[PDB]
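Help wanted!
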Amino acid sequence: SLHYDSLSKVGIIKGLTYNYKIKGSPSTKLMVVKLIPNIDGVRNCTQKQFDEYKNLVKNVLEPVKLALNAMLDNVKSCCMAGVALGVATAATVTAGIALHRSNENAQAIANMKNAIQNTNEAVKQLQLANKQTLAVIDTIRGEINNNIIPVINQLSCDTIGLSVGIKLTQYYSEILTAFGPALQNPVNTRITIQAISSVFNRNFDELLKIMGYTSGDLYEILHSGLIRGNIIDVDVEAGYIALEIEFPNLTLVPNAVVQELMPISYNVDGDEWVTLVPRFVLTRTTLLSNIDTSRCTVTESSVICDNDYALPMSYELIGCLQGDTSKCAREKVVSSYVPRFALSDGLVYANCLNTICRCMDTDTPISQSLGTTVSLLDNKKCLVYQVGDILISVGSYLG
Amino acid sequence: SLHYDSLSKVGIIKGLTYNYKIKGSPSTKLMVVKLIPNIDGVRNCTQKQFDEYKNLVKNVLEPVKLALNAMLDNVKSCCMAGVALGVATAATVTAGIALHRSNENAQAIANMKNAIQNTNEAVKQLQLANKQTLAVIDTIRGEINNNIIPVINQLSCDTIGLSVGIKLTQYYSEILTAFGPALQNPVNTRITIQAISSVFNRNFDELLKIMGYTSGDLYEILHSGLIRGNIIDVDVEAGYIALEIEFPNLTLVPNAVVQELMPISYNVDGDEWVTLVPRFVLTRTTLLSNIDTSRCTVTESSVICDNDYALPMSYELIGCLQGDTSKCAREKVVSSYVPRFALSDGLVYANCLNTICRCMDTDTPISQSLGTTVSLLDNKKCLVYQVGDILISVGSYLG
Amino acid sequence: SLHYDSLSKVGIIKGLTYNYKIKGSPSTKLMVVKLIPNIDGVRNCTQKQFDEYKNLVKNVLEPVKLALNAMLDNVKSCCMAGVALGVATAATVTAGIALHRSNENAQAIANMKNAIQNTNEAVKQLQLANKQTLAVIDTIRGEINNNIIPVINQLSCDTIGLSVGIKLTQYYSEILTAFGPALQNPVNTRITIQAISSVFNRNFDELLKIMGYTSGDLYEILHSGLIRGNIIDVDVEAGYIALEIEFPNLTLVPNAVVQELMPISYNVDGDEWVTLVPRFVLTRTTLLSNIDTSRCTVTESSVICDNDYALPMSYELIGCLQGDTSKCAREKVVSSYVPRFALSDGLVYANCLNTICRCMDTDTPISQSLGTTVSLLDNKKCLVYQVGDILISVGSYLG
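Answered by r_m:
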């Protein structure tokens, strides 16, 4: 679709071509982050700090459960009730309906309250009544079992209490850091698996492993941050927040590719100029449009986004990319650093009056006219060239 | 202020309304972060590493004290002398004046040098001579008391020295990570309580607790990053930096609200279009202006900023919001992901030709004319509507 | 270059003058991040988890070695080969050539495979065959020696296995977090020393120390993120990734300075206005150009950038800074927070119709006409002044 010859004459060079992927059809698994740990090994010396920690956990989980109930009541009443909400965007109403649909798994999790409380190690997998599986997180119990139980004989009782109080304070701080935006807005906020794992020593590989997935396998999903987490249920007395973590599938957009453009400085009457274009241009069947690659993720061979994220292009840029190059944006190179050459289709295009161009077959400098912008380098005249510092071999123009 | 009817006809929907808050009248408390810890218990095996760490701390703290002794004497000379400072912005001169005003607390801290040095646990509160209270941070001493002292019988002397050297290097690295911008510009740089706590295992709840504030009650200040810290005094021989932490009060701006606008796709002759506006618009008594919500923090009911940040609005955009909708910024949709419906004051506004609309109330579809942009759904015709995937009940227009 | 008098009359104040530095002529040193640790003290109880971790490391390192071998074969087949690569930018070709040039050090590292495997502490320095020195990282072995060996008698065999499995999973997660963008693109991706140290408990001072540089002396390079790392060799069976770290020298750009400008509100007919200009303006011998200070680093006396980054300047802004102030961009103030005064050349410039201005010598209000924008305060009339809340002494304009 792009007019590559005119763009090369203006100094715009075809780059890599990527596939394009969108989140779709997510699969979900359950996870319970227990805020009040099981401390049966050190229960005697932690009496004062544990009650304070329980009160602090209750004071931060009560508004969360109140906000969850204020959302469930709206749906349970009727179908979201457009009167009870008053105002919201489409995403909020969709999230509320999804939360009501997930209330069944919330009740299934709440059925396992005693088994959740009786977990006595860092990560445990429990068989749910619906034949599902959920992961229990007991980060403090890992700290206890690793740092206090092996040395329980040496430490005095007051020292144990102080150390466990510091550990509980640290875990509360980490929860407030990661789950902070979620506890203030439970129905809308989604937390990535890395941010969720930040309360578990940033060990997201262990979280993925216990839920059935090897971290090296899902890297196209994990890298783009598509493994989200959403609050499903909060119990203020048992002290846990349970999450439903998505593992979305990626669908190939039909007949859509993402094209990379590499800019090259070109000379006009001795002066260096760079043409200003988006570095990524999305090509559909009959349309050409921008793509905000910052909010997406660029992999080795594909571009992954959670939504379509396609944006229209100005008529000037459309004309620039379709062959009317007089309308392209361009700026003077007062800097000393710009790419003076690039390699595409086995041919190196270089700006030979602003950088040196030499042949190795005969050590003579090739001349490019002041009446042309970028010179084509290929096997028709010379076989291996030196541009700037580097010297590379080159294919043929006939290809 | 806003003309909601014309905006709805253009596809702009009234959202949530927030209060507006600004930092004002801060209260201050003192903390002493000690770089050179008390090392009693392992002093014999750490002789080589401790002296090297002391020299490194001296080398990193001497330029800080040199700069502090500058701005202070600049005031002590006279009032900030304009001849000695040569060039400075208003914030720098105000910060220097505040530093001189806090030099009294700096001297009070320096009076407690022996007690600060003799602290032998992670966090200790000392009664100052002015009846003030300050918090001592001894992060390495906590690491020692938790990891070396309980197993002091098993470790050989060389292993203790190597491990404590690694711990000292780790803490010095964390100090350079957090206080790095501060130690090269002490009078201007302000460090948030989370970034300060990053040298204390990211445990800011412990820092707030020892200084008298519960983290769960202080969230409206803590979340927006208004709990800052400023260098007040550095002692190169005792090896500590003393910080003064602000706990500002939030003032309600008189008769000022922040209005959220949510965009909705609207159709003209079959094509999807989205109107571009700021998502947050600030409304004063008789003025309308933008607000940089990126710098601010949006809570569940209010917007919190350290400065008012009331940027002005373009004349075209002002005309667009006040009723002249012909001048609004308008953009074609070339993406599958655009919000097609929104819910406000019990009514739902939807694009029924670019997404499906039906009446679950009477099992009939909902056609809107091609001559209108956005259709109004209310209880005049059907009681329950289905828009897209999701179906919602709806209030009445007469309200 | 800049016309400071007209800018002051428009409300633009001369600021600090900084030097300007660019990366150049880097020195390189080697390190080896060992992915598969030596755990011989706990080998019996960790047999199940260690074999799984070995397979995970192999699965995560095989594509990296394949990608490195592809780039090496594109060069050993000659000087890069334009036909084999097909398409790439200049940076990629330069990086591939540098990788082939560093293949000699890669082979030298691979010569020391048994010595690398047999190391048994966190950091060890090995004498390479080329008289070079390299640093080995064994982060898991540090965790073992600090947390498992001292309490090896108390822990049961199953508990040791579970704990070391959790530790190995944690290290794998940390490696995927830091080296993630590198393992998916080895030839191009460069990693800062802090990000590399994030797999070693964020202890970059220890990494710099073993390789021969004190962190305090190297802060000028370290702060700007110029200490990069590049993948040099991967061994999928021995389980390590070898990195080459650049310690670049900083070159003073000849006769180039970076100028800072304070914006100052000025009044025309009662209304506050702010002139919109870049906060940093670069001045060469005969040119004036913008500088992207966001990508650069501003120190106390100099600006450090990895590239020139001298962007061109608009004609209107050039005319504004060169004396044609009618073309300056100006903005109405509808905000309560604007800097109203600035100090430069010992002379304070203030907008006295929007803030109070007094002398303390006569204690009488300072009056500026509505027909002038900003007023000059100097020793010709009063010796000490008060502007707003703060009162400052001032120098003499007559000098």
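OP: Thanks! One thing I noticed: Residues 270 and 370 of chain B are 7 Å apart (CA to CA).
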